[PDB]
Amino acid sequence: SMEMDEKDFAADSWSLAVDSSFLQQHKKEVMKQQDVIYELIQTELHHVRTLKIMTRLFRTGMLEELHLEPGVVQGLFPCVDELSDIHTRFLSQLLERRRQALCPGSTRNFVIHRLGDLLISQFSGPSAEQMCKTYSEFCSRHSKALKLYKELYARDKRFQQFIRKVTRPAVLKRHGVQECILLVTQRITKYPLLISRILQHSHGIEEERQDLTTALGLVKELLSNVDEGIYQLEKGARLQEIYNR
Amino acid sequence: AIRKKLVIVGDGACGKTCLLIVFSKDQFPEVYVPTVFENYVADIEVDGKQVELALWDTAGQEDYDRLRPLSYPDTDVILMCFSIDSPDSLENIPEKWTPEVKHFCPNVPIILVGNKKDLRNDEHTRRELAKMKQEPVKPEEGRDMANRIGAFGYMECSAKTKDGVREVFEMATRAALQA
Numbered sequence: 001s002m003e004m005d006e007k008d009f010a011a012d013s014w015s016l017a018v019d020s021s022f023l024q025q026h027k028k029e030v031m032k033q034q035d036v037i038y039e040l041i042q043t044e045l046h047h048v049r050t051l052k053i054m055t056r057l058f059r060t061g062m063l064e065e066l067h068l069e070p071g072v073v074q075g076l077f078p079c080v081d082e083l084s085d086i087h088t089r090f091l092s093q094l095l096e097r098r099r100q101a102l103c104p105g106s107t108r109n110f111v112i113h114r115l116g117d118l119l120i121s122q123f124s125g126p127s128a129e130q131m132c133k134t135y136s137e138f139c140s141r142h143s144k145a146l147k148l149y150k151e152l153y154a155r156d157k158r159f160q161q162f163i164r165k166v167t168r169p170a171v172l173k174r175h176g177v178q179e180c181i182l183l184v185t186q187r188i189t190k191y192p193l194l195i196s197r198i199l200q201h202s203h204g205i206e207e208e209r210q211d212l213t214t215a216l217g218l219v220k221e222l223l224s225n226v227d228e229g230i231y232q233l234e235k236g237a238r239l240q241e242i243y244n245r
Numbered sequence: 246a247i248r249k250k251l252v253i254v255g256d257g258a259c260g261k262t263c264l265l266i267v268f269s270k271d272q273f274p275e276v277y278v279p280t281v282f283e284n285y286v287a288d289i290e291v292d293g294k295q296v297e298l299a300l301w302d303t304a305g306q307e308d309y310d311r312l313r314p315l316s317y318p319d320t321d322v323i324l325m326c327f328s329i330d331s332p333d334s335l336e337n338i339p340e341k342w343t344p345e346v347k348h349f350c351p352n353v354p355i356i357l358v359g360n361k362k363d364l365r366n367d368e369h370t371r372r373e374l375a376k377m378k379q380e381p382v383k384p385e386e387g388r389d390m391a392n393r394i395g396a397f398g399y400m401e402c403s404a405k406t407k408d409g410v411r412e413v414f415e416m417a418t419r420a421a422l423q424a
């Protein structure tokens with residue numbers, strides 16, 4: 001993550017991120033709504049950071065330092081560039097909505113009143129088709145990636161040294177290869193929880209309540225479609241095992 | 246320091262997300278209670294052994310039967326959660342969660358955890374459950390369910406007061422380290 005965004009999302013909540021004099025100007029219900037929207041954007045910033053660790057630290061490091069067989073890095077990190085493009089674009093839209101909402105003269109005081117429309121756009125049309133296609137592929141290659149990682153770590157000395165070297169810093173404690181893969185897989189199922197709680201505190205404006213209700217429905221449709229398009233790929237599985245599924 | 250993986254399973258109302266948050270912060274959040282939990286690696290020392298225990302939540306995966314098992318690979322210990330204020334969450338343990346955990350995590354120890362133990366003697370909880378002809382889960386009912394499902398052990402805790410929380414994770418670490 002870049003320093004500007006890390007600092008903007010350093011506080012545990014929206015109520016602790018904004019100036020206390022600004023916080024005192026809002027009703028209790030607005031603070032509760034803003035705290036949950038802040039959690040969505042903060043967790044999205046962290047999710048994009050997890051994808052940057054996978055693409056830049058892991059994937060690119062193995063290409064530039066190791067002599068792995070062709071197709072090995074792609075097997076370890078399936079669809080990482082596509083996942084990074086989907087979420088970096090979504091994070092850019094969320095951060096632009098926050099920035100436009102800042103008070104003049106402030107880099108921290110803002111209120112987001114219209115999140116619903118942004119969530120409808122992300123979870124519909126071509127962007128939803130791309131999210132569905134990408135996660136159906138990624139989640140179906142999860143077991144194969146984990147199994148290829150384990151074999152490499154146990155049999156390749158230079159691979160083991162590379163992993164131990166790049167994961168040694170304390171800031172990578174939660175982000176080894178398998179941990180990044182599971183953080184990404186679980187990201188999509190966090191959206192309904194966050195959206196329902198934002199909706200709970202967004203009844204003040206009826207158009208906003210309606211938009212978040214539509215967004216929640218679209219996110220659930222996407223998850224059901226992804227869940228239905230998953231079948232774990234297995235290295236060396238014979239056709240007979242597959243057509244007898 | 247050896248690395249071990251823990252996954253918590255159970256119904257949404259069981260309070261699994263709150264339990265992971267309270268343990269990882271060693272505090273019930275005073276300003277804001279997070280909606281979600283990403284992951285955490287806790288440094289635990291139990292019976293003189295140092296372990297890095299990775300923590301994972303399954304909240305949000307309950308309705309997705311093909312996404313949910315992706316959380317299970319290489320799990321060393323399972324926390325199977327129910328809420329003491331919800332006999333319905335306890336009934337779903339032998340029917341749904343136990344067969345699933347035994348299939349995807351064979352031979353992995355399961356600790357049955359009764360959450361929200363502070364609500365066992367809460368008058369509002371007793372009045373609300375009495376409308377559906379129910380009452381808070383009794384300690385012996387929890388022990389018997391744990392015995393029946395072949396759990397490694399039975400424990401109770403309250404994420405609200407923090408009582409029993411540390412003990413649950415230190416015992417999970419002990420279970421994860423066994424043969």
Ligand SMILES: CCNCc1cccc2[nH]ccc12
Nearest residue numbers: 031032033035036201276277
């Ligand atoms: C149980 C109701 N939650 C209250 C609350 C307090 C503080 C910040 C919050 N953000 C969303 C709900 C919220």
Ligand SMILES: CCNCc1cccc2[nH]ccc12
Nearest residue numbers: 246287288289290295296297
């Ligand atoms: C003062 C904290 N003790 C260090 C410790 C305890 C348990 C597990 C650990 N893994 C790495 C340090 C470590």
Ligand SMILES: CCNCc1cccc2[nH]ccc12
Nearest residue numbers: 310314341344345346348349
């Ligand atoms: C052969 C019976 N065990 C399969 C099983 C049990 C429980 C949950 C499950 N999800 C997918 C298979 C599955």
